[PDB]
Amino acid sequence: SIWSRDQIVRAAVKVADTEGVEAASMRRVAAELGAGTMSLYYYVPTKEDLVELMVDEVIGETRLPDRPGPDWRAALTLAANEKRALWLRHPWLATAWRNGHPVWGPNSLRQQEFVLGTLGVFDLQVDELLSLIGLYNGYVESFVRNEVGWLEEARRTKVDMREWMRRSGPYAQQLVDSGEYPMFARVLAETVAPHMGPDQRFRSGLERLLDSIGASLDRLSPP
Amino acid sequence: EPVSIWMLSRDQIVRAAVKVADTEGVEAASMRRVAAELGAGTMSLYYYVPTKEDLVELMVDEVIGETRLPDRPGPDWRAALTLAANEKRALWLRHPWLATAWRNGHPVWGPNSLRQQEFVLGTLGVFDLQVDELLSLIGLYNGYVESFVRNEVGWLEEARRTKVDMREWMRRSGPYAQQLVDSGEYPMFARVLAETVAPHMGPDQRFRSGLERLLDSIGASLDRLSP
Ligand SMILES: CC(=O)O[C@@H]1[C@@H](C)O[C@@H](c2ccc3c(c2O)[C@H](O)[C@]24O[C@@]2(C3=O)[C@@]2(O)C(=O)C=C(C)C[C@@]2(O)C[C@@H]4O)C[C@H]1OC(=O)/C=C/C=C/C=C/C=C/C(=O)Nc1c(O)c2ccc(O)c(Cl)c2oc1=O
Ligand SMILES: CC(=O)O[C@@H]1[C@@H](C)O[C@@H](c2ccc3c(c2O)[C@H](O)[C@]24O[C@@]2(C3=O)[C@@]2(O)C(=O)C=C(C)C[C@@]2(O)C[C@@H]4O)C[C@H]1OC(=O)/C=C/C=C/C=C/C=C/C(=O)Nc1c(O)c2ccc(O)c(Cl)c2oc1=O
Ligand SMILES: [Cl-]
Ligand SMILES: [Cl-]
Ligand SMILES: [Cl-]
Ligand SMILES: [Cl-]
Ligand SMILES: [Cl-]
Ligand SMILES: [Cl-]
Description:
2 copies of one chain form a homodimer.
Chain A: H1 5-23, H2 26-33, H3 37-43, H4 47-59, H5 72-89, H6 106-117, H7 126-157, H8 161-167, H9 169-178, H10 182-190, H11 198-220
Helix pairs in contact in A: 1-2, 1-4, 4-6, 5-7, 7-11
The structure holds simocyclinone D8 (2 copies) and chloride ion (6 copies).
Residues 25-26, 97, 100 of chain B line the site of one chloride ion (CL).
C-alpha cells in the first residue's frame, strides 16, 4: 500500500486542474518540478498511484468540523457544498477514479469519519447506515459529475446546458409527436429543476434527498 | 448550428464500433479503426457520423436495444425497479465501457434509451408525485445501480492490471486496516470493518441486499408523500 512525494503530487494537481489528468503524464510532472523523470518514479511508481495520491492530496484542502453535531441535515449539507466546490475546482475528481479498491489515505478517511459520523449516533445496522449514506453521496456525485460534464462539453461544442436545452427543442417536440414516450413528455411539460440555475438546483435536489433520508429514519425510529 | 445525430450504413458503422469497444475498450473503436474494419475509408464515415462523441452516443443506444423491459408499469413497483436493475447490470457487465464512456453533460435521447426510461419512470407514475419528486426517487434508485455496477467493473479492470481481485484485496489490506484501527482516529471506519456484512456476500447477493434497503427508503418517502 502506498499509504518529497507531496511536492510531486501538488505539481501533478496543478497540471491536472489546467490540462486534465491525461496531460499530467509522468514526463510533464517532472518538467513542472524541474527534475528528470528518473527520480519521480522512485517516489511514485505508477500513474495509477499518483492519481490516488492526488485524490487524497486535494481532499486535504477541505476542512469539516471535528464532529458533526446532532443536526445531521445541516452537517450533510455542509459536507455536500464542500464536496461540490472541491469537484468544480478539481473536475478530474469526477472521472479519474477508475479502480475498484477504495482510497484509504488519511484525508479521505478523515472526511468519511465526518460524513459517516452524521448518522453514526443512530442505532442502525452499519449496512443500513452505509445504504443511507450511499443515497446521499450518490446524489452529490451524480449531480456534480454531470455538472462537470457540461463544462467539459461546452469547452468543445461552445453549447452549455441552457443553450443545449433551447437547441434541443425541436428534437424534443419530435419525440413528443412520436407518441411513444408519454412519460418523457410529462417530464418535459412539468419539470421545474432544469430551469433553476446550478446552485439552486443542487440545493433543492439536496433537500429532497435529505427528506428521503429523513423519512427512512422515521421508519426505523418512529414517530 | 449542428443538429442532433438523432434528428455502408449507420447500423453497420455502429455495430462495428461496438465490437472493438466490447473486446478492447471504447478507445480502441475510433473512426479510423471502424473504417478499417468495414472495408471502407476514413472520410466516408463522417457523412453518417460527424463526431466521435456522436459515435459513442449511437453505440450506447445500440447496445441498450439488447434489453427489453415491459410495455407497461405494473402495480408492484419494487419488482419493477428490481427487474430494471437486474437488466441494467447484466447489460453493463456485457458492455463494461457503458460504466465510463458517458462523459458529457447532455442526456442520450436515442430511441432505445427512452423506451427503457418510460418503464422506469412509469413505475412510480401510479403515485400522486410532483414530477421532480418522481425524478428525485428515481435518482436514488439509478445512483444505487450505477455506483454498484461501475465499482464492480472497476474491480474487474483493476484485477486485470494487478491480478488482485476484491477478495484478495480485502485479505491483503488487513494489516493496514488494522494499523488504521490501532491509531484510534477512525472510529467509523473501525465500526464498518467490524460489523459490515455486504463485502462478504457474493456480488449477486450484495446487489440484491443493497437494492432491498434502497427500495425500503423509496417506500418510506412514498408513504409520507402519497398515502
Ligand atoms: C438530467 C436531464 O436529462 O435533464 C434534462 C435537461 C438537460 O433538458 C431538459 C429539457 C430539455 C428541453 C426542453 C425542456 C427541458 O426541461 C423544457 O422543459 C421544455 O420542453 C422544452 C424543451 O425544449 C420545450 O420548450 C420544447 O422546446 C419542446 C417541448 C415538447 C416542451 C417545451 O415546449 C416547453 C418545456 O418547458 C429535460 C431534462 O430531462 C430530465 O431531467 C430527465 C430526467 C429523467 C431521468 C430519468 C432517468 C430514469 C432512470 C432510468 O431510466 N434508469 C435506468 C434503468 O433502470 C435502466 C434499466 C435497464 C436498461 O437497459 C436501461 Cl438503458 C436503463 O436506463 C436507465 O436510465
Ligand atoms: C466501497 C468500499 O470501500 O468497500 C470496502 C471493501 C472493498 O473492503 C471492505 C473490507 C476491507 C478489509 C477487511 C474487511 C472488509 O469488509 C473485513 O470485513 C474485515 O475487517 C477485515 C478486513 O481486512 C479484517 O479481517 C482485517 O483483516 C482487519 C481488521 C481491522 C478487521 C478484520 O480482522 C475483520 C473482517 O474480516 C470494507 C468496505 O468498506 C466500505 O464498504 C465502506 C463504505 C463506506 C463508504 C462511505 C462513504 C462516505 C461518503 C463520503 O465520505 N462522502 C463524501 C463527502 O460528503 C465528502 C465531503 C467533502 C470532502 O472533502 C470529501 Cl473528500 C468527501 O468525501 C466523501 O466520500
Ligand atoms: Cl481530466
Ligand atoms: Cl500507470
Ligand atoms: Cl452548463
Ligand atoms: Cl475518431
Ligand atoms: Cl472502456
Ligand atoms: Cl473482484
